[PDB]
């Protein structure tokens, strides 16, 4: 029933200061239950990956899901907004029923601050049953001790709206701030994202690294694929060095 939310996406598989604690904080709670039972440590459930734009949290967390290799489920923010009623029990108990019974998967969501607004201005707003959905989320992630099952990963593009009652292991606990890392790191993750193609063995990474400023990872992959667009018709079967900065100065 309600295949629009039940069968959302049938998928199996798709900066060190945050990807270390992130990848560890999502991989070690999966298998390393022995030390969790020896030292009594509880696996973290909620994580707040916030910060300014220009980083690409969606594709970075998607790459983390590629590092986990487990099942991945896609879900967006405004997808909970539906004209029908009673979506809290049906959607929360449905997605948490398939996640409750099925194998341990990974559920990464985004745009949570917009749908998690407590309605400061009470003039007129329909965002009241999505607030019901949030109260049932904190209800089933707070009042249920057997909730050591499949985690729920959240991501917010801004911290303008923040519920002060989100202080719990099951709730948003790992407040990951974006310190705007160095450009060479984006040239490293982009170097890994572009090492498969035939690249000429002369790249200094200084120009193409410095040119990438406040640019998400999806835009960097748009620079790589965009470089492959004209690079396919350049005649040479190997990518050149000026095509990175040409793509940045072409679509960016």
């Amino acid at each position: 029933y309600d295949s629009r939310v039940k069968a959302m996406e049938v998928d199996e598989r798709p900066l060190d200061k945050q990807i270390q604690e992130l990848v560890e904080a999502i991989v070690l709670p999966m298998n390393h239950k022995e030390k969790f039972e020896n030292l009594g440590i509880q696996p973290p459930k909620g994580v707040l990956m916030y910060g300014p734009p220009g980083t690409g949290k969606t594709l970075l967390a998607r790459a983390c899901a590629a590092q986990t290799k487990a099942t991945f489920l896609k879900l967006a923010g405004p997808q909970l907004v539906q004209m029908f009623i009673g979506d809290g029990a049906k959607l929360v108990r449905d997605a948490f029923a398939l996640a409750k019974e099925k194998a341990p998967s990974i559920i990464f969501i985004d745009e949570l601050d917009a749908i998690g607004t407590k309605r400061f201005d009470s003039e007129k707003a329909g965002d009241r049953e999505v607030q019901r959905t949030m109260l049932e989320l904190l209800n089933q992630l707070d009042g249920f001790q057997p909730n050591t099952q499949v985690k729920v990963i959240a991501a917010t593009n801004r911290v303008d709206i923040l519920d002060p009652a989100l202080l719990r292991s099951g709730r948003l606990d790992r407040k990951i701030e974006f310190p705007m890392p160095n450009e060479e790191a984006r040239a490293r993750i982009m170097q890994i994202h572009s090492r498969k193609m035939n690249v000429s063995p002369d790249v200094n990474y200084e120009e193409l690294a410095r040119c990438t400023d406040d640019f998400n990872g999806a835009q960097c992959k748009a620079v790589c694929v965009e470089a492959g667009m004209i690079a396919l018709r350049r005649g040479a079967t190997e990518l050149t060095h000026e095509d990175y900065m040409e793509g940045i100065l072409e679509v960016q």
């Binding site: 004209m83 498969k196 748009a222 492959g228 667009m229 690079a231 396919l232 079967t237």
Partner: protein, 258 residues
């Protein structure tokens, strides 16, 4: 609906060199609509994948004709086009099985090219959830590489006020170029290859008749090329001369374009 029987495109039509003045853009789109099919191995060995596609919007001009031209100049098997004016109809919900059956036929056609026309009839998100299901399910079934993510991406629309396709198009669509309206010296090739009809006298200079018809769409100049032989045979003659229907030309554009 009529989109199932009207969806299949056949009966070839207006050919390549009748483009509306586009000299660079005809290569910018030919390199993705004709070159990948003619050289599949050259794009796999010479690079990583063939190009995705182009994007034509803005002024109407000769729109909706160049894609039928791409259907005409197909060397292997004419592809299927999809219009958007049939998606927004009463009793919504059939668009899911519709896009799944036309994409299912696309998988039945060894992943053939699928053109999408008139995105503005289902675009412009700005009670509209029934439209959001069709357009968000469509974009979900286009950006999603599960059926195919390499065939073709092209949206020929008139109004660019579509908010969601404008932000979702950087995912898989590309080449945010304009329409490149036909210039003055563009129609001379339309006359050159449209001279393949009944024997036309060589006194008709194609540059003069081409430059004496401004602001004329591709369908308009096609109707002029049809009325040239029409008003040329209505006189029970055997040859066509510009002096026989010049008044019909400058009248059919002037009196009908004031």
């Amino acid at each position: 609906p009529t989109v199932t029987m009207m969806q299949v495109e056949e009966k070839p039509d207006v050919t390549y060199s009748d483009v509306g003045g586009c000299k660079e853009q005809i290569e910018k789109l030919r390199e993705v609509v004709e070159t990948p099919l003619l050289h599949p191995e050259r794009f796999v060995n010479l690079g990583i994948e063939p190009p995705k596609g182009v994007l034509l919007f803005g002024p109407p001009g000769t729109g909706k004709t160049l894609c039928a031209r791409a259907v005409a100049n197909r060397t292997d098997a004419c592809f299927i086009r999809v219009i958007g004016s049939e998606l927004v109809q009463k009793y919504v919900g059939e668009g899911a099985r519709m896009v799944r059956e036309l994409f299912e036929m696309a998988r039945t056609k060894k992943a053939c090219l699928i053109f999408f026309d008139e995105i503005d009839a289902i675009g412009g998100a700005r009670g509209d959830n029934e439209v959001q299901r069709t357009m968000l399910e469509l974009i979900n079934q286009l950006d999603g590489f599960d059926p195919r993510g390499n065939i073709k991406v092209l949206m020929a629309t008139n109004r660019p006020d579509t908010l969601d396709p404008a932000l979702m198009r950087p995912g898989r669509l590309d080449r945010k170029i304009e329409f490149s309206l036909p210039d003055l010296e563009g129609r001379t090739h339309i006359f050159k290859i449209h001279a393949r009809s009944m024997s036309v006298e060589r006194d008709i200079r194609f540059e003069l008749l081409a430059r004496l018809c401004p602001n004329s769409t591709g369908a308009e100049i096609r109707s002029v090329c049809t009325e040239a032989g029409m008003f040329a045979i209505r006189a029970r003659r055997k040859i066509a001369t510009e002096k026989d229907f010049l008044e019909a030309v400058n009248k059919v554009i002037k009196s009908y374009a004031k």
